[PDB]
Design a protein around this ligand. Sequence first.
Ligand SMILES: *[C@@H]1O[C@H](CO)[C@@H](O)[C@H](O)[C@H]1NC(C)=O
Ligand SMILES: *[C@@H]1O[C@H](CO)[C@@H](O)[C@H](O)[C@H]1NC(C)=O
Ligand SMILES: *[C@@H]1O[C@H](CO)[C@@H](O)[C@H](O)[C@H]1NC(C)=O
Ligand SMILES: *[C@@H]1O[C@H](CO)[C@@H](O)[C@H](O)[C@H]1NC(C)=O
Lengths: 30, 21, 816, 807
Amino acid sequence: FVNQHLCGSHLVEALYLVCGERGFFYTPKT
Amino acid sequence: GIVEQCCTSICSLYQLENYCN
Amino acid sequence: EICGPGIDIRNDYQQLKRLENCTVIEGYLHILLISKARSYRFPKLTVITEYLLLFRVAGLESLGDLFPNLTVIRGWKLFYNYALVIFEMTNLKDIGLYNLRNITRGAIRIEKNADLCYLSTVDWSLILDAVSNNYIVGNKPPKECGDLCPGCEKTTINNEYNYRCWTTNRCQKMCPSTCGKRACTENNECCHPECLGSCSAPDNDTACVACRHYYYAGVCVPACPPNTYRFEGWRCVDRDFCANILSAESSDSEGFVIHDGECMQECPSGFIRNGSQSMYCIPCEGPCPKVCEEEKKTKTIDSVTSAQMLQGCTIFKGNLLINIRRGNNIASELENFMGLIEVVTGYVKIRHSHALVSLSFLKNLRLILGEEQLEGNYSFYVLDNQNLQQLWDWDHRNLTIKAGKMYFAFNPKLCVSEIYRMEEVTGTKGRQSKGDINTRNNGERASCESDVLHFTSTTTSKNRIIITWHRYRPPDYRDLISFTVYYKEAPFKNVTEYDGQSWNMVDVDLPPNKDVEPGILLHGLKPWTQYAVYVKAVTLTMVENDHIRGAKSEILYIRTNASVPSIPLDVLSASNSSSQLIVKWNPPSLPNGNLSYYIVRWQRQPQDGYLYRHNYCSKDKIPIRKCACPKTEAEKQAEKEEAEYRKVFENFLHNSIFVPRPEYPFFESRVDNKERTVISNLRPFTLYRIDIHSCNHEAEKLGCSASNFVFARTMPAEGADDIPGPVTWEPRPENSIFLKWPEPENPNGLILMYEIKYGSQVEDQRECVSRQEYRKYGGAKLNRLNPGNYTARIQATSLSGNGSWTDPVFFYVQAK
Amino acid sequence: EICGPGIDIRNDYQQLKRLENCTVIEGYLHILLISKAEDYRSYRFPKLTVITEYLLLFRVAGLESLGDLFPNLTVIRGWKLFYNYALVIFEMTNLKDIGLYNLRNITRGAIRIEKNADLCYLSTVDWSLILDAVSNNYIVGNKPPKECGDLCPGTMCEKTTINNEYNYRCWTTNRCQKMCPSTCGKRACTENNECCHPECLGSCSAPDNDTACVACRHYYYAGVCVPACPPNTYRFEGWRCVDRDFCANILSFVIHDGECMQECPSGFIRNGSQSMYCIPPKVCEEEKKTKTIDSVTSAQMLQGCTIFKGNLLINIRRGNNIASELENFMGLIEVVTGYVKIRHSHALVSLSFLKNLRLILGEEQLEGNYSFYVLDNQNLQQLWDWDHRNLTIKAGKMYFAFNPKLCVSEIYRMEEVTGTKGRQSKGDINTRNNGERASCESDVLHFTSTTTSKNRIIITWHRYRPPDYRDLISFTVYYKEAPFKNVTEYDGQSWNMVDVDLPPNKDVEPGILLHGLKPWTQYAVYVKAVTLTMVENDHIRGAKSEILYIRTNASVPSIPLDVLSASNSSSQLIVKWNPPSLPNGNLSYYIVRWQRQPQDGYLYRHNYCSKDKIPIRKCACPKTEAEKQAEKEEAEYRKVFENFLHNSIFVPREYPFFESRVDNKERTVISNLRPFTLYRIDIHSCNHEAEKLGCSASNFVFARTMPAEGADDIPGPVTWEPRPENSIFLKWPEPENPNGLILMYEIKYGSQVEDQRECVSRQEYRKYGGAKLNRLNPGNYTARIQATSLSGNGSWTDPVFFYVQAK
Ligand SMILES: *[C@@H]1O[C@H](CO)[C@@H](O)[C@H](O)[C@H]1NC(C)=O
Ligand SMILES: *[C@@H]1O[C@H](CO)[C@@H](O)[C@H](O)[C@H]1NC(C)=O
Ligand SMILES: *[C@@H]1O[C@H](CO)[C@@H](O)[C@H](O)[C@H]1NC(C)=O
Ligand SMILES: *[C@@H]1O[C@H](CO)[C@@H](O)[C@H](O)[C@H]1NC(C)=O
């Protein structure tokens, strides 16, 4: 994570590095 | 949308634990 | 009679007859497009002040037919720095002109004269100083020319020495060294020092053809007495004469003036007239007042040509519009024609001027007096300039408007902030009102605030620069698309972004790594210069109308490196006297530094061995005949639009994916200040090689330049090659005679052969003796001579020509 | 099976197992963010054949090619879309080839493939064969073309004209693009390329059997494809028809016009008697104030709404025919309660699609209180306010700017229909940017007179008297060089503009003098009057003259270029040249003149046996400023003369000039000349008017022909006679015809070996016809002779035998 403004590919990479595995979802069940 | 939180404002961690492990 | 202004004589000889009575021509002389319809001679003409020109004067074989007595071309005004032109003289077989003695000013140009021989048989260094600037091209190849003039003197033409001659019947007469730099008459009697050309009598100022400095009442004078004034740079006249001449008819036609003793049609730059239709220029306290005015109340300018009429005006007492719809590099020429206009009494208006990006071309406007203020009292008014970016409002200029408010509308690219600053400086600080100068449509599309890039590092070389700047992150990193860099040659520091575009472009692209500060290499420069450089950032502004900015570094001035100087130009040398040389050359083309001095080096080149072996008493020759500019339109939209159509899908994916939980030695010497050096203590007849180096202040470290070279031969030692002693004769059988004689001790280069002139009653018989033959025998044998007494002479042919004949040799042959 | 709504596979390759059974999906298919990228080839799914909505793949880092996952995906119906697209493959960091080799028909949407680092085989497959409107596809940012290099096996593979190219077509390195010949035409086809029934779409398991269809190009029911599904069968999700047993049990439904829908449409409403009755309004809801529209995905959210209580902003950047679809979704809107705006809608050519809009109530307005706003529509040629249809704005301002192709009168025409003139200043409806490239209403000015010369044109036009004479302010005259008549007013403003003012005298019609034109050239000219477009708007009539073509008369040209000559064979001389620099008209021919220049009588006066002089020996780089100045100066120099050669020099039209004229070519040969004799070659250069005005001047050269080898040799035998003092006279004939001249003769002779050599002058032979060799030593002798001509030494004569008696 960086305290700068996150956007685009940088956003996706930072999001992965923050969450990692088994934590990140989009729910069709909703 | 997530961009309006992050591409316009800043997104601290507290705004991002919601869907991490 | 002194002919008047320039004669032109085209379309027939019968108009050439005008030249019959006058002995001096004032001004040029054009002879154009004649065609034979005949013998004409004009022995009156002697001096042509200014130049001469001939062009397609068909049927003319030589200028020696017309002007046998042309002696001086003073060249006071020149034809593009040429004092003589002979162009496409299709039938001209020789220049002639055999009495031409001096061309005071300018060079000579003789080209495409398809049959012009006798080009290099003239010592041009004896008629004119700057032989380097001459220009001879395309004429008949001198190699196929005859150049067979009688046989007269000869001179050392650079490496070669040979006869000099104007035409087949004449030689280029010159004075001897006894008179030195003085003029001379035909019989070599030194003339009056203030005399030019030939003389009727020696050392008499009243007997000359032309006076080098000045002429007055038939008396050559260095500077004519006080109460006389210089006229046309060769003669003097009284004060009242200049007052009685009227210049060419014109709105400004007036009498002549007197300044520094010179009589001129108008006052010189830096001086102007007093108003009494005076005859006295005066100091001009500063700039001088013109006061141009026009016929219209208002001078409309539609293009450069219409502004040309203001060319040379300073104070325009009238209104102005500018309606320059289109045209290239207009501002650069408006600077020349109109930039000096410094007070406009009316108003100033610009409309539809889509060619102007800056009003800098009005360099020195320091007042708009507003005598013609418009509705609402407007005196400065610009409307619908779809390309205007910068009024004349740099930190380094001021302005003042006496009266009348301002108006600006439909200027898409003009910062409203810039016009605020402008109205602050112009003194009209608070006269206007909100509606006069609107904020809606002015500058609506200007990137009117910009971040600053920083140059992190710089790297310089001769012929290359390597430069880098920090990584610019705009708020949203996809907005930056590329970098663009500008540079130009700038020897001074008064430069700005809006100087025409004069500016070069490169197209560095965003770094492909993510830990490397960008950078560019500028290649193809030249040393010791001072280039200017600034960077900008191409960025995607769509809906960033108030989100992103541009970037702009400071104009940063840097100077490449220092090379070793470069070659010396036009190295030319002659020998005025034996054992001395004179050398002249021109500065090197590329200093690569502030020139410190030059270095001259000479070595005695060996005399060729080729010349020893061959028996020229037996030989012959023959005659004959028989990286890109991708700007285009890709860059405008085809890469801007296509990177703001991938930044608006990506913001539809992430927003419907992510959901959260609730032979000889070399010498060397050094010249000081001027390109000239008289070497002394040389051999009488030695060929030299000269190597001439240029060394700047930085060449002490880098070494000196490459050597431009020329071969120079000294004048032969007079009388050195004549036979030094008496000849000896001995009898031989078969009524033969053997002759032995001494060789010269110090010959001019070499002794090639001997010629024996002999006979019983008259010396009809002649024989050639080779140098090798003399070495073997010490002479030659004459065989089977008829009985009787005989007398003979011998001649030795040295490299400098034939020597002097011997004391006649008396001998006899008996029958038995 | 028939999968339920949508299938979102994510988190890890394990969950992808949810597709293990499924053969057709009534929903989108998302494969996203499988970050582990490890299991990769551990899963396969041959069941899937038909997807009724789009298909999306995003950052599945571990996959190599979709051919491993979905071998039999046959039709992607695209009944919905993902931002105008039915198939999206984005940021697939490790995808090398697409695959999907059985895919044969995409119905509705386009395709976007983007930012795939190493996806080759893009554009190597003819997309027009799989879907229509290839112009709506968008492939960019992929691996650069030249890097990998597409190939098929043996590259031996199927072919067509890919766009304008012609090459193999490759799904992947192992499989060609399975395509069957054109013989089937519109029909589908099976393996071995046999045409099936016209209701099969894509593949087909048996030839010409309805049941064998993999998918149905119209509808599917009871395992059989049918152009229209049976009676009492209600079209559902646009690919299958069902009955009340189904639609009654989906989780919250209604019926109408045979479609099974979530709600009744506009003009029909629920009837409480029975749920099926959509008995004969519809409102979209708002969450944002500004409901921006950029794509059919966002426009489709409005489908069927009668009243939109929000704000519209339209930003349609691209789309070849998007206007067709927007009509079906938005065409049923009649009220927009908020403001309406447009922005960079460079795709809209007409607002006609908003079929039934009536009111813009302006409950909310932009900054500055604008209720209808239009800006920078680079292609908006037409508004929808034709007099046939009404548009009522209930409050607020208008505004218009930067509408390059919208003709301004149309805005005013719309301005009338709404009756809203009394709310706007110049800036709002200015003419200085809104509409300056579209034509229409215009009086016609009549050119009363024309006058032309070689360098000037004078024209006059009738007095335009508008309904108020004060409206006109000036006349503007446009002209440009136009060799061909395919010219229009809007060809770039190359068009020179000139300003002319109506003369104060009202009895004289205006006119202009144009100067500085090229002679003999076509110039286009038309006239547009300038009027004060205000107060009565469109009633300011405007005027435009027709485009008029004028050509100014003519004059003369220039000469032959690169005149050169040489000799290849005796009596022949080859001559070349080029066209002149400025013909200033149609060239016609050249003229060649030639003349003998004498053998040098100047030269047979010299005694070459006498003294002769000693031989003396034996990505365009830039441009510096100074340069610019330099190559300017030379320019002024060479221009100073040309205006001299002119003065219309006008050539009306020892040995004389022989003459001939050139027919077709800039080279000519003249033969049968005197060998080795010097000549002159002179050439003029002519135009089609050189027959009357005279032909341009000459560029000339000289030539010496090839000598006849041995012609300089002695033409006969040598003769010898004795002479006193042991002397010998040799008499030989002179060469009748020399190679330019006879210069000299040389005799080599000797007693036992021909050591002796001497030089015999030409004049000596003239006096005596020979030479006397005098005072020879006793003994026999031999002797040969070499005349020297201008072409070099001849051949040596035959041996000459003579002797000297000792007694
Ligand atoms: C800048 O200074 C130079 C002096 O080197 C001068 O020639 C020039 O006119 C000045 N102004 C500009 C715009 O270059
Ligand atoms: C696939 O079908 C089989 C057979 O009915 C069933 O056992 C299995 O659970 C199904 N798998 C899924 C993921 O529904
Ligand atoms: C795909 O199928 C649709 C069904 O209507 C048809 O309109 C379209 O022409 C087909 N395209 C191709 C390339 O066969
Ligand atoms: C402009 O709109 C605002 C908000 O709807 C309204 O309050 C105001 O009265 C309007 N007129 C103005 C600002 O002149």
